[PDB]
Each structure stands twice: as structure tokens, then as C-alpha cells.
């Protein structure tokens, strides 16, 4: 019936995409010496596995989240705790620092993204909003601005939320597996989302449209980050490979792998020049890759459990890592 | 020295934050965390009601031991992407209805779920408290519907004591790591009084055994 006619059209279109991409394959990216960072600061205080960490825009503050039921706002230069925020739900999977420094996002198995107000007359930190509406766990959240946040969840969708009204304004559908991570374009116009379909999608924030679908992993994508100029992504997955994708070519550009890495990738990030790609693994360490050659550039060792999160400051000065051993470390 | 008047004050604030985190940690350390798993249309609701949408948390106090149970039903998403978040729970409570045997039968699904959790890499040292639910319904059904419906090899009497023991054995032998964890099995129904005492006693045994390993007697 019409069901088979449409499935046949879909297969024909998949091949048109394949060939359009093959037609652009006239080169590969493959056609920094050694990186030796040291721990400069160790941030102690969490009493449970850390799942999320995010740098603020002043390159000095951090927000981190763990299963001890708290968020901690840290002074990365002095190691002082600035704030500690009790959570209503201890099963926190993600957090985010607003670019303005005014708010913190947080959530996980409660399927709610909570927004915390860090700058109040009372001196304390309060929940301003609970962005309920996802049916699956919140896997990742990122702010576009003080009134807008982007979320992804275990129900296979992503959403753009209006914080003041607490509503979804745009729902981004089309992934078939749980969505694991978000990354925002430098100009906020595009999102990239990774999922358990072993694929990533490029979304137009203003429309709800999926512009491109990137495939190639043998397993779930756990993390995605944008290359600093906005025209490429790096992804990391359970197949223990990181992959670089080209948004203008709609192609995989390079892969990062090694025979001795059979562990999953939990986090990816780029340095300012985009030359170094950093990835956290289930080996309790982080590998630093030469993003343009795929050589290993160096290793950040020192965690006693899985590295769960990475981040690089906006000024490019430091790398923070966090793990399941309950500590954060700042590398430079 | 070397700090300004305001940095000294910022440090004092940080130290008070650490004090409060430690005190809160000590309190958490004395709570019993229980994960609640089970078959659909089973006894999970029965157990919570007798003992007492995303993750649902229920609190209990019994014989001065404080418990928190985490119901992870509703979260119809990929288990492999979050179940590790319960590594560290004291015990897992797993619900199976005895009546599942003649309803792929529900009992087969219940055994498959049990095995996926029981032999999960994240729960290697976590014990299971197994509730075999609706025993009164089971007696009424077993006398007409034998266990050979889902367990063809069964050759015992079609009555509660032998058939129920058979079912218990079928679940307890799904434990592929008998050296690290025990399965505590209790037969219950919609009306009972002992489910809280049972969980309490099973938990107390789990605590003692974990302390033998922690203390080096292993």
C-alpha cells in the first residue's frame, strides 16, 4: 500500500544523501607535539559521584552537581565554595551555568529542569522555576539567555523552554533513542543533539526543524561539543571513538581512536583554537587529541573513577574534569 | 595572612559550607537506600502501601532505622543509561506476582527482569529482597492451572506450599554470583503485617555482612 511506497521513497532519498556526500569526498582531514597538563587545583566537597560540571563565563566560577543532592558553586582560583544549593531531587544528571551568571539549571531522573536564582535580595539561592513537561530523564540542559533554556531528555526529544512562563515553545522531535547531550552553536542559532541512535542531529532553534542528521557511530553518543568556529562538531560514544563532523559538507571528517581504548567516552570538549580535543573516558582519565591529525597529544590522569564531565574555560586557560570519585580537578 | 579583609570573610563562608556538607553527609550515611523494581501489574504498589512523572521517593521509619525507597517505574527510557545511578543502594526490592505463572507468560517476563538486574554489573554486591506477591490468589489459581503452563518440568502437587517453593527456587537460582549477594524471599499478599519487619531484618543482615567486609573479616 502507501506504506511501502513511502518506505521505498525514503530509501531512495537515503541514497541521494549518501551520494551527495560521497561526491564531496575529495579529501580527508588527515590529508602539536606533547601536551603535559598538571593539576593546579583540586576541588573537594562533594560526597558522591559527580555527573555534571559547567564553567561560568568569567572563567572563574564553576557549577557542579552530584548525587549527594547538591550543586556547588566554586571559586576556581581560590577553591572556596561560593554557594551550596540543596536539591529536591538527588538524581541529578545535568546542570548549567547561565551566561549572565544569574542563574543555574539543574535536573535528572525527576524529568524536570529546575532554574535557580543566584542573585537574590535575601542572600540565599532559590528555585525560580520548575520546567516540568519532559516524560523522560533530563540528560542535558544549556541556557541561551536568562529567559531561555534548551533541554534534552530520555523521551527522545529536545525542547526550547520559555523560563518565565515555564512553557515549551519549541519541541524538537526525530531522534528515536534517548537523547544524551546538547551543544549550542557559538551564536545560539543551532543546536546539536546526540542520542542512543548512534547519530546526531543539527537543529534550527528558531523553527524546530532538523537540518542535518549525522551518523557513523557503532553505539550511543554520550557527548557532543561544537568546534569553536561553529562549522564542526566532535562527538563521543560508547564505541570508544570520538568523531569530528563537518556541517557544511554533511560528512564525517575525522575519527579519533586507539587500539588500547575500549572504554566509553563520557565527555568531549575543545580548546579555543580547536586544535586540541579532549575526551573523558571510563578508564578514569582524559585523553587529549590533536584534533587535526588524530594523534594522541597527551593524557590527564589522576581520577580514581570514571571521568564524567569536562569543561574548558572561555579564556582557554584551564580544563576542569570531574568524576565519579567525587572530586573535580583543574588542569593547566 | 596575604588575604584581604574580604577574602578572609569569603574563606570563613566556605568553611561553614564545608561544615554543613559534612553534617548532611553523615546523616545521609545512616539512611537505608532501597531500589524498587518489579514486573508491571505486580505488587509494587502493595509493598509501598504496606511499608508506608519521574522517580518516586518514599520515606519510612522502623525500629529507629530510616529508609528511602526509590520507585523507578514510570521512567520508560533506556535503563542502561541510568541504572548505574543506583550503584550503592543497600538493597533492591524486586516484586513478582505468583499469579504471573499462567498469564510469553508474565512469569517469564518477571524472571527475565530479575536476571537482568540480579546479574547486572552495577549490582555485583547488592542484595535482593524478593517479594512473591498475591499468594492467596495463587492458591486459588494453582488448584485449576498447574505450574506446567510456564514451567513444563514441574511435577509436584498443584498447591501453594510445593508450587510456591518451586517458584522461589526458580528465582533464587538466577543468582549467578552467590558468593557476593543473597536473595531474601518472602511470600506475601495484599493483606500482611510482616513486610516491613522482613525488609528491616533483611537490611540488618545486609548491613552486618557489609561491615564484615569493611572491617577486613570478609
Amino acid at each position, epitope marked *: 500500500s502507501e506504506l511501502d511506497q513511502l518506505r521505498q521513497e525514503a530509501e531512495q532519498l537515503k541514497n541521494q544523501i549518501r551520494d551527495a556526500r560521497k561526491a564531496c569526498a575529495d579529501a580527508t582531514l588527515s590529508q602539536v607535539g606533547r601536551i603535559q597538563m598538571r593539576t593546579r587545583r583540586t576541588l573537594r566537597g562533594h560526597l558522591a559521584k559527580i555527573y555534571a560540571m559547567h564553567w561560568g563565563t568569567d572563567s572563574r566560577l564553576l557549577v557542579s552537581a552530584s548525587q549527594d543532592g547538591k550543586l556547588i558553586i566554586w571559586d576556581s582560583y581560590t577553591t572556596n565554595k561560593v554557594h551550596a544549593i540543596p536539591l529536591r531531587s538527588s538524581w541529578v544528571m545535568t546542570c548549567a551555568y547561565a551566561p549572565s551568571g544569574n542563574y543555574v539549571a539543574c535536573g535528572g531522573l525527576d524529568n524536570i529542569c529546575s532554574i535557580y536564582n543566584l542573585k537574590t535580595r535575601e542572600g*540565599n539561592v532559590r528555585v525560580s522555576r520548575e520546567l516540568a513537561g519532559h516524560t523522560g530523564y533530563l540528560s542535558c540542559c544549556r541556557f541561551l539567555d536568562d529567559n531561555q533554556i534548551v533541554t534534552s531528555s530520555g523521551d527522545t526529544t529536545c525542547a526550547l523552554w520559555d523560563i518565565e512562563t515555564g512553557q515549551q515553545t519549541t519541541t524538537f522531535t526525530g531522534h528515536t533513542g534517548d537523547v544524551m547531550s546538547l551543544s549550542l552553536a557559538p551564536d545560539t542559532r543551532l543546536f546539536v543533539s546526540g542520542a542512543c541512535d548512534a547519530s546526531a542531529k543539527l537543529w534550527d532553534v528558531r523553527e524546530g526543524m532538523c537540518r542535518q542528521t549525522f551518523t557513523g557511530h557503532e553505539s550511543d553518543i554520550n557527548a557532543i561539543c561544537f568546534f569553536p568556529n561553529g562549522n564542526a562538531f566532535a562527538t563521543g560514544s560508547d564505541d570508544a571513538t570520538c568523531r569530528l563532523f563537518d556541517l557544511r559538507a554533511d560528512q564525517e571528517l575525522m575519527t579519533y581512536s586507539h587500539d588500547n581504548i575500549i572504554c566509553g567516552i563520557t565527555s568531549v570538549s575543545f580548546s579555543k583554537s580547536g586544535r586540541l580535543l579532549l575526551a573523558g573516558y571510563d578508564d578514569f582519565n582524559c585523553n587529549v587529541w590533536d584534533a587535526l591529525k588524530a594523534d594522541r597529544a597527551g593524557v590527564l590522569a589522576g581520577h580514581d573513577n570514571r571521568v564524567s564531565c569536562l569543561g574548558v574555560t572561555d579564556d582557554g586557560m584551564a580544563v576542569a574534569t570531574g568524576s565519579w570519585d567525587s572530586f573535580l580537578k583543574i588542569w593547566n | 595572612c596575604t588575604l584581604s579583609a574580604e577574602d578572609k570573610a569569603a574563606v570563613e563562608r566556605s568553611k561553614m559550607i564545608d561544615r554543613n556538607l559534612r553534617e548532611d553527609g553523615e546523616k545521609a550515611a545512616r539512611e537505608v537506600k532501597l531500589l524498587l523494581l518489579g514486573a508491571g501489574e505486580s505488587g509494587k504498589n502493595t509493598i509501598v502501601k504496606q511499608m508506608k512523572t519521574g522517580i518516586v521517593e518514599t520515606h519510612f521509619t522502623f525500629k529507629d532505622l530510616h529508609f528511602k525507597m526509590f520507585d523507578v517505574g514510570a521512567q520508560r527510557s533506556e535503563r542502561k543509561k541510568w541504572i548505574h545511578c543506583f550503584e550503592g543502594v543497600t538493597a533492591i526490592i524486586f516484586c513478582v506476582a505468583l499469579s504471573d505463572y499462567d498469564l510469553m507468560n508474565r512469569m517469564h517476563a518477571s524472571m527475565k527482569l530479575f536476571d537482568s538486574i540480579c546479574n547486572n554489573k552495577w549490582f555485583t554486591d547488592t542484595s535482593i529482597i524478593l517479594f512473591l506477591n498475591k499468594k492467596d490468589l495463587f492458591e486459588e489459581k494453582i488448584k485449576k492451572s498447574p505450574l506446567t503452563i510456564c514451567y513444563p518440568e514441574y511435577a509436584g502437587s498443584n498447591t501453594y506450599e510445593e508450587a510456591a517453593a518451586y517458584i522461589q527456587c526458580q528465582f533464587e537460582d538466577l543468582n549467578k554470583r552467590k558468593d557476593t549477594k543473597e536473595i531474601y524471599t518472602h511470600f506475601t499478599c495484599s493483606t500482611d503485617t510482616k513486610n516491613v519487619q522482613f525488609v528491616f531484618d533483611a537490611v540488618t543482615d545486609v548491613i552486618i555482612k557489609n561491615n564484615l567486609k569493611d572491617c577486613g573479616l570478609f
Partner: single-chain antibody
Amino acid sequence: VQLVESGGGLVQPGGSRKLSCSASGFAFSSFGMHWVRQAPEKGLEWVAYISSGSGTIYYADTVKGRFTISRDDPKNTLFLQMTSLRSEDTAMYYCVRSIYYYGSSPFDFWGQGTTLTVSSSDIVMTQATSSVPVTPGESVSISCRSSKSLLHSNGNTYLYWFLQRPGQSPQLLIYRMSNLASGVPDRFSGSGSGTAFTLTISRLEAEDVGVYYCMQHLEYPLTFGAGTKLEL
């Protein structure tokens, strides 16, 4: 956010009084507190400080040994117990809110004050001009000098500016040498060298006429300049 002082009125020299300062509308236990005194015809003087958690206590050496500062967090109450009172202690006593963390703005809330009448190596700062005639819409520059650099090794300059309107307690305008207080309009701004500072009002409004004070917060005791009055 409210602070209400009490315990004022006339006491004879050698006697004693307690000022109470009841707080509401804020997380009192998270803030340190200060007492700031103002003699009837004078500027501001810092008297005492108690940290949040009561870990740290400082006193001016003009009151140390006679005054005791204490707090009772469960009752949101800040006390100052003064004994052996002198005619020197006649003043308005203000209860002042202060929280310290990276990015905080200390001294952002003052109470209204209680008036106490008693019968009969510091860093210091100079406000060279005691008075500036002004009109609405005019550009006004208020200067202040320090005997010591207020610029620390941590990169911050510890200079605060406050405005006391007639009949009102002081308002914080600026908390880092150049960092404007919340609720204060863009009309106000400031800068400095670490020893020389300026407060700028780009256009003066009639409502902003009053006495501007320069405060040092690098070291204890905290100190203030004499104050510059605008006349409109």
C-alpha cells in the same frame, strides 16, 4: 529586607544600654553584621563587626573593651551591648548588613538607626571638598584620597561609596571601586588609581543631593572619609 534598631534615648555617663536591631526579609544568619555610628554633626564611624556564624569579631579601638557585639540567629537579632558610656558615644547607631563571597556587594543595606544620647596605623581617607554647589542636570565629581593603596594583590580595589540623603540612612552606591550597587542608576560610576578615587554623577537629579561618603574596606578597622555634601 528590613533592619530596625532600638535601645536609644538618654543615658547618663558611666551607664549602659543594648541596641537589639531586629532583622527581617532576608537570610540573616548568612550575613555578617556591622554597627556604624554617626555623631549628630559628624560623618560615619565603624564600630563593630560580627561574622556570619560568629566566628570573627572586630571592634573599633575607640570602643573595644566597653562594647560587645553579639547575634542570635534564631531570632534574627543583632545586639550591641555598651557599657561605661561616654558623652563621646552620643550618636545615631546604624545596623548594617554585609555578606562576603566572590562577586558579593557588602554594606548594601542599612537600617534607619537608633539615637543614643549620653549626657556629659589606620588607613585613613580624605574627602578634600566638604561641599559642592550643584544644579539638576549638572555633572558632579566627588573625590577621595587614601593614605594607603586600596588595591590588593588579588586585583581588587577596596573602595565603597555611600550616599546619605537628608533624613535617611546611607545607601550603597558603589561596592568595588568601579562596580555599581544593585538598584543604583547608571548616573553613578567611579574609578581610581588605588590611592586616588572619583565618584561621578553624570547628570545630577534633585533626589541625589546629599552627603557622599568614601569607605575603606581593605583592613580593619573600616574607615570613612569626612563626607562631601552637595548643595542644590
